[PDB]
């Protein structure tokens, strides 16, 4: 028995958001719903298709009939940004089945281009026969970037380790990218660039082996 | 210490009011119990402190009396109430029962059917001869059977047996067995049993000559 | 289910002891007592004793003093009756009955006024010098003479057996109307003897076979004697 | 009403982990406990339930054979053992209380969740970080930091000037490298004017390898 | 009034509550009469045998309804198992109603038999109590009240305290609430209306049983506090014959009302969970029917 959920739903602060949970004859199953905020344990927000547990606001409601269960979130606050999971119990297989989840994105939040800082290798690391370029990316929102390195305009993908975005204390996001090369490779090129793309704009920082 | 029931045998019909009397030799206060005993079965408790009806015993059963005089009463004699009844003192730690009071079914006088049986040939080979006189389905129970061998009345050589009153015709049956050694039996010709009963206007005789 | 189950029939020689058991169910054994009462063949009821299931206190009849010993076993809820130095006049059905727990104790009737309210099935105890013997079954044959109207009588003399009982049936149980099996009598010889008769129509003497089925389990005896009409 | 699970686990493949979950604010034997796992960035996977009264369990198909659920009623605690861990078992494991009160629920659903226990699976060996200075260079504000290279396992603590410097500091989440080792940077945004009078030392501490390193970050000399 | 209880599956019984209290009350009078004087403590086993003989007889009259009781059990089996016979709930509810009516009818018929056994216990108990005397009528001993309490009542007060009766009621409210919550959700999806009708019926029976348990729990709690306060007053002192006797009747009254509510609450608890076992099964079967259906 499978529960199919749209991977993403996005709404404006005052608008109402609908999260669907598809399943054959889901109308005969009792659907429970969970909200899981980023880096948090899930919380039960609707049980038995439409009932709200104590402490759950009236903005949250649910319905279920046919092949679609719906979680309706009226007057969506920014704090409602979470993954939402529907759940059923299927007696035929004796299994608790959870849907794939729906990420709720709340619009209206202002876009911030990333701040980029590129550090060339330290003399101490070069003395140890190694070379790591450090690209620090911070203060960006929506919270998603693509990172491209270059060596004299030719793209570089080998030796690149890039982190997933992370929510900062100020609600903006952060990421870091590393380029591990050999000291000989480092000294061979004229320049090295770290290009950060955020929405449709690239922020570039360039470091040269001939700098001090 | 000594209970005496009166009467010892009582003739009654279904629907009748019957009252057994139990007398004690010395005062037993109200410490008297009553019992019912159907033949071949165990007695059942009927009444406890001379009047306390035991749980589940028909309400037709009632008791009364104190000191020396006590009475058991059955208001409407039903087909099951025909049995012998016992009264019992428990004033002293040594219990004493009464002699019993038989309650039998009353019906019309039925004359017995009389049959005489000579000894079998196999029993004669054994060295003894038993002649049995059968009185079949008679009423009342009181009957006199006399054995006459060549008109000589016999005494001490016969044994009687009576059945329980019949569940379908309320009659009794009796078997009287006259026993003689082969030597004594082969010394006489006529063997007869004379039966006397209220249903017979004059004694009925059943006889045979041996051989 | 409140009940008292007693041990089976017993045949003992004069001067011997008997041990009758009485197992209780459906009640608290240690909260009551057991009374023992017997009945000699064709006679009234006679009380022999009492024992308490609570403390084992006993009260015997004066007739049985120094001969009877009733004991008890709280573990199995059983009451025993042991009568030694047995005599001919000890032949009786011995019964056990539920009684109060403190009959000795003065003013006992004020705290438990009930009579002997639950009885065991009884235990046939026969005292005798006699030895086991299967009965000799003799026919009691009808004839043209000695037939009252159209009704003929025939039977079986189940003579000289020991001990009681024997069972008589006619035609393997197929014949039941008009049959009278008489209570046995104990003869001077120490042996029992009885008659089982059947009244039948005269029209059947020469056409229907009549067999009496005597079965004396004590001596493993099974006798099927054919009763045949005497021609003469 | 709470479920408090045991702390983060770091295990090698082929090893086992017994995670605990202590119940509070209610009678532990009156409600079933479920276990659900979550791979990073992925959905909720029901692993199975346990009846805390009898100890009877029900394992999901994919978790049968290598998951064992038990409880100790004396201490209101349920456990889940993962036997013979593999790389793909890196996930947050959760314990969650069924909303049905009593035995044999006709339907199953959760109302109270534990905080999660991260189980990390790697064949890497405990290695202390090599620490490097990210010298300040070229508005009126300068960026300098430390590079905490090739350490395993998490976590590393980065302090500035023995804890005294906490403004303008940004210690960044670590990258897991293809080698199995971690690397992180800690940048501190300082006034450019301070660069000649204020000395900056980063203090790195890796408790698993018992490594404590201090690194002076001075403006690049030429 | 009469209560019909279900300790376990296939085990229906009945209690005529006023008879239970009446019979228990006169058991307390009986023991208090023999414990007042040391010269009558041995008679305890005779009182025991009498009281057990009275209940044996009481139970034999209850046994007269065995066949009508067994009838109701079978009808209840059809009601509690609609998944095994599968049609017309109304007919099944009417069936239960009349079979239950027939049991109360049998009970009412034996009213006089039940009253004679009760009135024999009253006469017995008042007989011992009316002959209770003191060496000094101005100074009657309360050692009998003390002994009887220690050996007959204190064991029940400790036993009832060890059980958390107030959490038994909390547990039952969670059961009732989650059952209605699921019931209301399933009713909106249909399936076998026979299953929803029998769930609604068993559920309402359970609320009624709960009300009786809640009511008996309040009495158990109040009487345990009242017996414990009142026992202090009637002990460790003497009384005039009149006041001692009024105090023996007052204690006996408190004990009998407490023992009654304890006996009934225990039996109603067995009934609530016996009925709950069947509600659970029907919930399991309705969910099976609903999920294994067409769209």
Short mmCIF file of N, CA, C and O in Angstrom, two decimals, chain E residues 21-22 24-33 36 121-132 141-142 144-146 148 153 223 226-227 230-231 234 239-259:
data_model
loop_
_atom_site.label_atom_id
_atom_site.label_comp_id
_atom_site.label_asym_id
_atom_site.label_seq_id
_atom_site.Cartn_x
_atom_site.Cartn_y
_atom_site.Cartn_z
N UNK E 21 -26.44 -6.86 50.36
CA UNK E 21 -26.19 -5.99 51.51
C UNK E 21 -26.86 -6.53 52.76
O UNK E 21 -26.23 -6.51 53.82
N UNK E 22 -28.14 -6.99 52.64
CA UNK E 22 -28.95 -7.54 53.72
C UNK E 22 -28.22 -8.73 54.35
O UNK E 22 -28.00 -8.72 55.56
N UNK E 24 -25.04 -9.60 54.02
CA UNK E 24 -23.72 -9.24 54.56
C UNK E 24 -23.84 -8.57 55.92
O UNK E 24 -23.10 -8.88 56.85
N UNK E 25 -24.82 -7.68 56.04
CA UNK E 25 -25.13 -6.95 57.26
C UNK E 25 -25.38 -7.90 58.44
O UNK E 25 -24.90 -7.64 59.54
N UNK E 26 -26.11 -8.99 58.19
CA UNK E 26 -26.44 -9.92 59.25
C UNK E 26 -25.32 -10.92 59.58
O UNK E 26 -25.34 -11.52 60.67
N UNK E 27 -24.30 -11.02 58.70
CA UNK E 27 -23.06 -11.76 58.92
C UNK E 27 -22.23 -10.92 59.94
O UNK E 27 -21.63 -11.49 60.86
N UNK E 28 -22.20 -9.58 59.79
CA UNK E 28 -21.44 -8.74 60.73
C UNK E 28 -22.04 -8.78 62.13
O UNK E 28 -21.28 -8.84 63.09
N UNK E 29 -23.40 -8.79 62.24
CA UNK E 29 -24.10 -8.86 63.54
C UNK E 29 -23.75 -10.16 64.25
O UNK E 29 -23.53 -10.16 65.45
N UNK E 30 -23.72 -11.27 63.49
CA UNK E 30 -23.43 -12.61 63.95
C UNK E 30 -22.05 -12.70 64.56
O UNK E 30 -21.91 -13.16 65.70
N UNK E 31 -21.02 -12.22 63.83
CA UNK E 31 -19.66 -12.26 64.36
C UNK E 31 -19.49 -11.32 65.55
O UNK E 31 -18.86 -11.69 66.53
N UNK E 32 -20.11 -10.14 65.50
CA UNK E 32 -20.02 -9.20 66.62
C UNK E 32 -20.68 -9.75 67.89
O UNK E 32 -20.25 -9.41 68.98
N UNK E 33 -21.70 -10.61 67.75
CA UNK E 33 -22.38 -11.19 68.92
C UNK E 33 -21.53 -12.25 69.60
O UNK E 33 -21.54 -12.36 70.83
N UNK E 36 -18.15 -10.56 71.26
CA UNK E 36 -18.31 -9.69 72.42
C UNK E 36 -17.79 -10.34 73.71
O UNK E 36 -17.15 -9.67 74.51
N UNK E 121 -31.51 -15.67 57.68
CA UNK E 121 -30.24 -15.05 58.06
C UNK E 121 -30.51 -13.90 59.04
O UNK E 121 -29.79 -13.77 60.03
N UNK E 122 -31.57 -13.10 58.79
CA UNK E 122 -31.94 -12.01 59.69
C UNK E 122 -32.33 -12.58 61.05
O UNK E 122 -31.82 -12.11 62.08
N UNK E 123 -33.22 -13.59 61.07
CA UNK E 123 -33.68 -14.22 62.31
C UNK E 123 -32.51 -14.83 63.07
O UNK E 123 -32.43 -14.68 64.29
N UNK E 124 -31.58 -15.47 62.34
CA UNK E 124 -30.41 -16.07 62.97
C UNK E 124 -29.51 -15.02 63.61
O UNK E 124 -29.09 -15.20 64.76
N UNK E 125 -29.21 -13.97 62.86
CA UNK E 125 -28.32 -12.89 63.30
C UNK E 125 -28.89 -12.10 64.45
O UNK E 125 -28.17 -11.80 65.40
N UNK E 126 -30.20 -11.76 64.38
CA UNK E 126 -30.86 -11.03 65.46
C UNK E 126 -30.99 -11.91 66.71
O UNK E 126 -30.98 -11.38 67.80
N UNK E 127 -31.09 -13.24 66.56
CA UNK E 127 -31.18 -14.13 67.70
C UNK E 127 -29.93 -14.07 68.57
O UNK E 127 -30.06 -14.00 69.79
N UNK E 128 -28.72 -14.09 67.97
CA UNK E 128 -27.45 -14.02 68.71
C UNK E 128 -27.22 -12.63 69.34
O UNK E 128 -26.69 -12.51 70.45
N UNK E 129 -27.61 -11.60 68.59
CA UNK E 129 -27.50 -10.19 68.94
C UNK E 129 -28.43 -9.82 70.06
O UNK E 129 -28.04 -9.08 70.94
N UNK E 130 -29.65 -10.32 70.05
CA UNK E 130 -30.62 -10.06 71.11
C UNK E 130 -30.26 -10.76 72.43
O UNK E 130 -30.82 -10.40 73.46
N UNK E 131 -29.36 -11.76 72.41
CA UNK E 131 -28.91 -12.41 73.64
C UNK E 131 -27.51 -11.96 74.09
O UNK E 131 -26.94 -12.54 75.02
N UNK E 132 -26.95 -10.92 73.44
CA UNK E 132 -25.66 -10.35 73.77
C UNK E 132 -25.80 -9.58 75.08
O UNK E 132 -26.61 -8.66 75.16
N UNK E 141 -17.89 -4.09 77.13
CA UNK E 141 -16.63 -4.13 76.39
C UNK E 141 -16.72 -3.97 74.86
O UNK E 141 -17.63 -4.48 74.22
N UNK E 142 -15.74 -3.26 74.29
CA UNK E 142 -15.69 -3.09 72.84
C UNK E 142 -14.59 -3.94 72.20
O UNK E 142 -14.18 -3.66 71.08
N UNK E 144 -14.92 -7.02 71.19
CA UNK E 144 -15.57 -7.72 70.10
C UNK E 144 -15.58 -6.86 68.85
O UNK E 144 -15.34 -7.36 67.75
N UNK E 145 -15.85 -5.55 69.01
CA UNK E 145 -15.85 -4.62 67.87
C UNK E 145 -14.43 -4.50 67.30
O UNK E 145 -14.26 -4.45 66.08
N UNK E 146 -13.42 -4.49 68.19
CA UNK E 146 -12.03 -4.42 67.83
C UNK E 146 -11.57 -5.68 67.07
O UNK E 146 -11.10 -5.56 65.94
N UNK E 148 -13.28 -8.15 65.60
CA UNK E 148 -14.01 -8.28 64.34
C UNK E 148 -13.45 -7.35 63.29
O UNK E 148 -13.38 -7.72 62.12
N UNK E 153 -12.47 -6.76 58.80
CA UNK E 153 -12.62 -5.54 58.00
C UNK E 153 -11.29 -4.88 57.58
O UNK E 153 -11.21 -4.40 56.46
N UNK E 223 -16.74 5.30 52.30
CA UNK E 223 -16.94 4.32 53.35
C UNK E 223 -15.61 3.89 53.99
O UNK E 223 -15.57 3.76 55.20
N UNK E 226 -15.02 6.63 56.35
CA UNK E 226 -16.03 6.63 57.42
C UNK E 226 -15.82 5.46 58.42
O UNK E 226 -15.90 5.66 59.62
N UNK E 227 -15.53 4.27 57.94
CA UNK E 227 -15.28 3.10 58.80
C UNK E 227 -14.06 3.37 59.67
O UNK E 227 -14.09 3.03 60.85
N UNK E 230 -15.08 6.24 62.30
CA UNK E 230 -16.02 5.65 63.24
C UNK E 230 -15.46 4.53 64.10
O UNK E 230 -15.85 4.44 65.25
N UNK E 231 -14.53 3.71 63.59
CA UNK E 231 -13.98 2.59 64.37
C UNK E 231 -13.25 3.11 65.59
O UNK E 231 -13.46 2.58 66.68
N UNK E 234 -15.66 3.87 68.50
CA UNK E 234 -16.27 2.67 69.10
C UNK E 234 -15.32 1.68 69.71
O UNK E 234 -15.73 0.57 70.03
N UNK E 239 -19.21 1.10 76.79
CA UNK E 239 -20.46 1.81 76.51
C UNK E 239 -21.55 1.25 77.38
O UNK E 239 -21.43 0.11 77.85
N UNK E 240 -22.67 1.98 77.53
CA UNK E 240 -23.85 1.40 78.17
C UNK E 240 -24.42 0.40 77.11
O UNK E 240 -24.29 0.65 75.91
N UNK E 241 -25.01 -0.74 77.54
CA UNK E 241 -25.62 -1.77 76.67
C UNK E 241 -26.36 -1.20 75.48
O UNK E 241 -26.05 -1.56 74.36
N UNK E 242 -27.25 -0.22 75.70
CA UNK E 242 -27.98 0.42 74.60
C UNK E 242 -27.05 1.03 73.55
O UNK E 242 -27.21 0.74 72.37
N UNK E 243 -26.12 1.92 73.96
CA UNK E 243 -25.19 2.60 73.07
C UNK E 243 -24.21 1.61 72.36
O UNK E 243 -23.88 1.79 71.19
N UNK E 244 -23.77 0.56 73.07
CA UNK E 244 -22.88 -0.46 72.45
C UNK E 244 -23.64 -1.11 71.29
O UNK E 244 -23.05 -1.21 70.20
N UNK E 245 -24.89 -1.52 71.51
CA UNK E 245 -25.70 -2.17 70.50
C UNK E 245 -26.03 -1.26 69.33
O UNK E 245 -25.93 -1.70 68.20
N UNK E 246 -26.35 0.03 69.58
CA UNK E 246 -26.61 0.96 68.47
C UNK E 246 -25.34 1.14 67.63
O UNK E 246 -25.42 1.27 66.40
N UNK E 247 -24.16 1.09 68.28
CA UNK E 247 -22.88 1.21 67.62
C UNK E 247 -22.48 -0.06 66.86
O UNK E 247 -21.80 0.03 65.83
N UNK E 248 -22.93 -1.24 67.31
CA UNK E 248 -22.68 -2.47 66.58
C UNK E 248 -23.51 -2.44 65.29
O UNK E 248 -22.99 -2.76 64.23
N UNK E 249 -24.76 -1.99 65.36
CA UNK E 249 -25.61 -1.89 64.18
C UNK E 249 -25.11 -0.85 63.17
O UNK E 249 -25.24 -1.04 61.96
N UNK E 250 -24.53 0.25 63.69
CA UNK E 250 -24.02 1.31 62.83
C UNK E 250 -22.77 0.88 62.08
O UNK E 250 -22.60 1.23 60.90
N UNK E 251 -21.90 0.09 62.75
CA UNK E 251 -20.69 -0.38 62.09
C UNK E 251 -21.04 -1.39 61.05
O UNK E 251 -20.57 -1.28 59.92
N UNK E 252 -21.93 -2.33 61.39
CA UNK E 252 -22.37 -3.39 60.49
C UNK E 252 -22.97 -2.81 59.22
O UNK E 252 -22.70 -3.30 58.13
N UNK E 253 -23.73 -1.73 59.36
CA UNK E 253 -24.34 -1.02 58.26
C UNK E 253 -23.24 -0.44 57.35
O UNK E 253 -23.31 -0.63 56.13
N UNK E 254 -22.23 0.23 57.91
CA UNK E 254 -21.14 0.80 57.12
C UNK E 254 -20.37 -0.28 56.37
O UNK E 254 -20.07 -0.11 55.19
N UNK E 255 -20.02 -1.39 57.06
CA UNK E 255 -19.26 -2.49 56.47
C UNK E 255 -20.02 -3.10 55.31
O UNK E 255 -19.43 -3.35 54.26
N UNK E 256 -21.33 -3.36 55.50
CA UNK E 256 -22.11 -4.01 54.48
C UNK E 256 -22.26 -3.16 53.23
O UNK E 256 -22.23 -3.70 52.13
N UNK E 257 -22.38 -1.84 53.39
CA UNK E 257 -22.48 -0.95 52.24
C UNK E 257 -21.17 -0.83 51.47
O UNK E 257 -21.18 -0.61 50.26
N UNK E 258 -20.05 -0.94 52.18
CA UNK E 258 -18.72 -0.84 51.60
C UNK E 258 -18.43 -2.15 50.84
O UNK E 258 -18.10 -2.11 49.65
N UNK E 259 -18.60 -3.30 51.52
CA UNK E 259 -18.39 -4.62 50.95
C UNK E 259 -19.26 -4.82 49.68
O UNK E 259 -18.76 -5.32 48.68
#
